[model samples]
Target chain A: PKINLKKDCVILFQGDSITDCGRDRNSNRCNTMEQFGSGYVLFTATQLLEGKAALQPKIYNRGISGNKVYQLRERWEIDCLAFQPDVLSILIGVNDYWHTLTHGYKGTVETYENDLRALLKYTKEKLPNTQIVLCEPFTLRDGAAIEDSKWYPMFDEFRKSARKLSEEFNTIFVPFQSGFDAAVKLAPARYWSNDGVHPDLPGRQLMANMWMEATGLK
Target chain B: APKINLKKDCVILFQGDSITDCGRDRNSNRCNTMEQFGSGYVLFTATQLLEGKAALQPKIYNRGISGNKVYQLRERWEIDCLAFQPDVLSILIGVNDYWHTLTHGYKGTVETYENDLRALLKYTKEKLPNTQIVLCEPFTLRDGAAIEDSKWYPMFDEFRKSARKLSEEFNTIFVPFQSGFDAAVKLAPARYWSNDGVHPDLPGRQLMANMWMEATGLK
Candidate 1:
């Protein structure tokens, strides 16, 4: 089912630094720079605010830098569920796996999937009407850290899990992995990312478009 | 060539819609982010200005909102433009006013375009009396997603005329884009200049930058 953005509806974007995108923390006001992170969230919010100026939907972004699923679960009550958002968009799993390589996480693929399921289940039970958009965590390999073969198979699992859970949860599933895989054909891979993990300007815009397309707004 | 005499330590600001938005970072506060500047005429002009005058170091800002009209610019003027207190303000608007009316069902008229533009310039002058203003004429080629039907001409010409009238009335420099593109079209096909009649391709953007520099008489 398509989730329509209504007047006064609250849309919350959650996940890791990619979603964080350098949002200002001093303020958490709706439609302001501080609240909406600098990445796809801001871009999407700008377009939504402009396109639906009359609806006046309240948009919030609570994506913290370097956060994983367990971390999202830890702060779920305050950072998310509390808002009672009409639409909830999640872009996680990258740092969930990235930290394993850099931060020495003991959690395996089981922990990642289980934690994600629990998080969505919590939202379903707490806010039954809220829409969920599970964005596939994406990466590009244009001479960067993500080019390492170690990220494969393991990282690929997270993408598949996000897709599977989106169906099971009956939520809008944004397939960013394929969208990005296609985008790089037109634009250089390096143009999309600085180090293959974090996105450059073009990558962020691509994600914004993908999110809109998934939401049936495009 | 119109000679440019930029004031030392002056603040120059660029304003317009998606043509101006080439692909800027909405969150970037300051300049020098090549991508944030968008690979358009503004970026080209900024690069030339920064390189040519190492000592002056005039601060430049671009606040062009994609899918925006003159009325929208007025709404955000307080924060995006007035706050900067620009010594020189360059504007390239009107295309969206016409484009939106046809495509997005916008109710704005050429009267609305001219009046909103007048109000904006009036506000700018009242806020910063000595600010030098440069009004870039909005232009489009007959190619890509842009409508080629002659139905577009009457409205577009009115928008261009409004800009020129405002420029003269405000005692500002006018970048005659319609004339320039009219001449450039003879050299290249419409598709070669823009993806849509409204937005410029790289070559088209370079041509606009060259005209901007020429208008300022920058060697």
Candidate 2:
């Protein structure tokens, strides 16, 4: 069944920098643009709040700019569980693999899968009715440090892990990596995302569209 | 003071192509980052906003995709434009749509540019009717800005007119840049402004920043 946005529903977007987009951490209010950041969450919030003003869904973005699975676990209580959103959208995995390269993060795919499953299990225990929208982390080889070929097969494994886990959790899976792969055919990788890791305008737009379609918002 | 009904937290997003991009750090991809804002009119304007509106604390973002056309902007409008739900949105695009035809073998014409631009504005109006809009006239500096060839004159002028007409139709703020630069030329040589006749030098960007600040009334 498609997760319909009901009136007075609370939606919270959770993940790393791509999700962070530049949200105002200082403010505790929901639905404002600054709290939503400048990325897809901002885009999604605009659609939900502005496009469907009558629905009046309260939304929040709690994604930090540079966070991995463990960091999310570190702050899940205050950031995620406290929000207790009716709908929770997550876009992670890029930094789980990305930090290993630049930040010397030692997390392996198995560790990532374990940490994610544990997080989800905890979420289920707390907010059982929260419809989950799990987003797969995506990257392109547009000549950035994160898109180094060393992350190839291992990165693909993370994508697979997200898909399998989404199915197991029965949550909505946004196929961002594949969606981007298809988008690159429409335009060059650089046009979509300047860096292979984080999305630029086109890349963020693609994510927003895909996310809306996946969530049945559009 | 807040010269424009801009709230303490209103988002002001800048959109365009490479001319707007001006070398942002796509690698870090963090908003409000120094290099991420790019060293151009957008950044200069942002600094003024920061100093002028320290009390309001409005958020500023730059989302100019390098080497993009209007259609490309349309492709990313969902996230880049509509998603922000900005209280104010400033758009400066169209030169690449025309420039690419001469150099990059792009097939878009002035009509296509107008239609795409109109469609984007229409979408914004439908989605966020209360939001303020800003349209920047596409400009080219003669003998330096990006084209010395005589072919760029009338064709480029069409785009500027289209932008103006769109602004009037939508009742949005229109930023007229061509005339401003024409006036600036009397102060300094054309080459002194932009290096490639397209990308602006610091002085050229300062001219743009001043024009934007004046037009938007962003004191």
Across A90-170, the per-residue lDDT of candidate 1 in tens digits comes to 999888888888989887778888999998998899999999999888788673877457787778888888888999998
lDDT of 2 by residue, B1-219 (tens): 223467876788889999787777756344544566776678656655643554455678888988999889889888777887888888999889899998899999989998998889998899988888888988877878458567688778888988999988888888888888888676556765675778776556757876887888874
Q: Best candidate per TM-score, number?
A: 1
Q: Which parts of model 2 have CA positions greater than 4 angstroms off?
A: B1-219
Q: What is the DockQ of candidate 2?
A: 0.01
Deviation in angstroms for B7 in model 1?
33
- What lDDT does the true structure give each of the candidates? 0.78, 0.78
Interface RMSD for all numbered candidates: 14.3, 17.7
Clashing pairs in 2: A43-B83, B144-B197, B145-B197, B145-B198, B146-B197
The TM-score, computed over Cα atoms with residue i paired to residue i, of candidate 2 is 0.53
